[PDB]
Every structure is written in structure tokens, then in C-alpha cells.
Design a protein around this ligand. Structure first.
Ligand code: ACV
Length: 329
């Protein structure tokens, strides 16, 4: 009764190479998907997603309550006032099923200028004990750079799709200052499943996370093979099929801002499914002071009335707004 959403599988491998016409043909596919449901699967992306899933499971299934408190963000542990973004987001048995671990740019160290300056949205990552989680930090930091590289390539596609030179976005997506984050989300199997963790949509659908747009330029998402996402279209909410070999890509509201809503941030939600599974987004955020001039590709002269908005302000306010709207995760 629910229709399947059109979510094309785009071979993005040319975006890593030097064949300009082949890159334009990928860009066209990104344009079409961005103008249609707003989602596509990136395939032939080069990332070892089997290792990502296996190592994430080993971490989620071995971390203990003590370790979660010791890594917890300030929402769960008032001792950790500097941890707004990075750390552990705890479950609450009987009430809240989801739990997750967020980390930021590994280059944010105590001596990084933005850490020294105490600039908002920048934090030094927290990590579990190496002996208790051997290889996890190294795996996770390398994963950040692998998905960074895929995201760079995707941003070349989006730039070309919009009629720009290929580094239009990517030049502002940089290892030294990116505010991008990885979140390793566990959605557990639970029986009895906590009713407080289920929301009911206007159409009666049981949900684990309510409708929203993304706080990102783009979002680059791995999920294990359990169908759960739905996208709002003119025809109603439609099911996004799972594909645990690809990355699900969509635009966030900063892309909508920069393109005068030509590439919309698609509204989507997470159905409740009682199955153990993984949701592993990478949020492609620019640097704190990144302030690209909005444009309008619909207009012959390409100009837009929208005012420039620095990425850091956008991100800080967007993440608070999403918590207020859809709850602390
Ligand atoms: C829809 C999925 C991406 C996933 N949802 C999510 O990850 C939701 C909506 S995009 N994301 C957030 O809450 C924003 C996390 C931001 C992160 N702490 C950071 O500091 O950068 C889910 O499976 O629930």
C-alpha cells in the first residue's frame, strides 16, 4: 500500500577520476535524483562497508554502562560540559531504544586553533579504552577519512550538476577545519519494545524518528539491510529500500539555502522496525567560517536574494533546533 520511492543507484566511480565527460554524465544523474525524490544510492564508492558494519557492531555490542557514562555527552553527564556533539548518546531501558556514538574531525586536538579559541561546534573527540576496544579508534579515524574522500567526490558531482566548476563545494570541505561528523547509531531489537520510543505519524505509521530535514550540506549514509526510511513526496511518504552495499545520499538544508531551494532538502522519517540494525551517517559540514554566496540556477543571471550564512552559525542553530523538534537522541 506504501509505494517504493525512486532511489536510483548511481555509479560514482568516475568522480574519483579525470574523465570529464564521464563526470558530467554522473553529475546529470545526481541532478535528476536531486530534482526528483532527493535521494540516490552511491555505488562503486570504494569503501569497505563490511568492515565498517563489523567493527561498529563489535563496539556497540561490547561497550558497557560504565564506559558509556565515561564517554557520555553533556545531555547525559553534567560533568562533560565540553561534550555537546562528540561522545556517547545513551539509551534509557524502558523508555528510549536508540543509542549512538558521535565523533568529529580527528584533526581537532588540544592545539588546533579552533579548540584553542574555544570556538563553538569544535570539540576534541573522546574514545573508549584501547585495551577494551582494540583497534576501534584507529578504525574509526580511518573511516572518517575514507568517507571524507567519498564525500569530496560526491561534492564534485553536485557542483558539476549545478553548472559550476567541480571544486565549487569541495574546496571548502577541508581536512583541517571540516565540521563533519560520523554517528554510529544502534537501533536494537527489544521485546517488550518500549512504547515511549515509538511515535505515531499523522498517517498512523509507527516511527522511531520523526519527519525532518537534514542539518548538512549533504548526508552520506550507510545502513544495514533493514528497510526503515521513508521520504515525503507530493504523492505521500514512500519507502526507501535498503541497500547495504551502497551509501544513501541526500541534500541537507544548507544546500537548499545555497541553491535557493533548487535542490531541496528532502523531508524524511524513520519507521519503527523491531530489528537489530545500524544507521551510520556522515554529515558533510563545511568549516566554521565558510560563507558561500547563495545562487539561483533557475535564473539566467544565476543570482539569488538569499543572504550568505556562515556554516558555523547554521550548524550550531540547526542542531539545537533538531533536538527541540525531534528530541534528544
Ligand atoms: C536518518 C538517519 C541519518 C538517522 N538520523 C540522524 O542521524 C538524525 C537525523 S539526520 N541526526 C541527528 O540527530 C543529528 C546528529 C548531529 C551530530 N550529533 C553532530 O554533532 O554532528 C537515523 O537513523 O535516525
Amino acid at each position: 500500500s506504501v509505494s517504493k520511492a525512486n532511489v536510483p543507484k548511481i555509479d560514482v566511480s568516475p568522480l574519483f577520476g579525470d574523465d570529464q565527460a564521464a563526470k558530467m554524465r554522473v553529475a546529470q544523474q545526481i541532478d535528476a535524483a536531486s530534482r526528483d525524490t532527493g535521494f540516490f544510492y552511491a555505488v562503486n564508492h570504494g569503501i569497505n562497508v563490511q568492515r565498517l558494519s563489523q567493527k561498529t557492531k563489535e563496539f556497540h555490542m561490547s561497550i558497557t554502562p560504565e564506559e558509556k557514562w565515561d564517554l557520555a555527552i553533556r545531555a547525559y553527564n553534567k560533568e562533560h560540559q565540553d561534550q555537546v556533539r562528540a561522545g556517547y548518546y545513551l539509551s534509557i531501558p524502558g523508555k528510549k531504544a536508540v543509542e549512538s556514538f558521535c565523533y568529529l574531525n580527528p584533526n581537532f586536538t588540544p592545539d588546533h586553533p579552533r579548540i584553542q579559541a574555544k570556538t563553538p561546534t569544535h570539540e576534541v573527540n573522546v574514545w573508549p579504552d584501547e585495551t577494551k576496544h582494540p583497534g576501534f579508534q584507529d578504525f574509526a579515524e580511518q573511516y572518517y577519512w575514507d568517507v571524507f574522500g567519498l564525500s569530496s567526490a560526491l561534492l564534485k558531482g553536485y557542483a558539476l550538476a549545478l553548472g559550476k566548476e567541480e571544486n565549487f563545494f569541495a574546496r571548502h570541505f577541508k581536512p583541517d577545519d571540516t565540521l563533519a561528523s560520523v554517528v554510529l547509531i544502534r537501533y536494537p531489537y527489544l521485546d517488550p519494545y518500549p512504547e515511549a520510543a515509538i511515535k505515531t505519524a499523522a498517517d498512523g505509521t509507527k516511527l522511531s524518528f520523526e519527519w525532518h530535514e537534514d542539518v548538512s550540506l549533504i548526508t552520506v549514509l550507510y545502513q544495514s539491510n533493514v528497510q526503515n526510511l521513508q521520504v515525503e513526496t507530493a504523492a505521500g511518504y514512500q519507502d526507501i529500500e535498503a541497500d547495504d552495499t551502497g551509501y544513501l545520499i541526500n541534500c541537507g538544508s544548507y544546500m537548499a539555502h545555497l541553491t535557493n531551494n533548487y535542490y531541496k532538502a528532502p523531508i524524511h522519517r524513520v519507521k519503527w522496525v523491531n530489528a537489530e540494525r545500524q544507521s551510520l551517517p556522515f554529515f558533510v559540514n563545511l568549516g566554521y567560517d565558510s560563507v558561500i554566496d547563495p545562487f539561483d540556477p533557475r535564473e539566467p543571471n544565476g543570482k539569488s536574494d538569499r543572504e550568505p550564512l556562515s556554516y558555523g552559525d547554521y550548524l550550531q542553530n540547526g542542531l539545537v533546533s533538531l533536538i527541540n523538534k525531534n528530541g534528544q537522541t
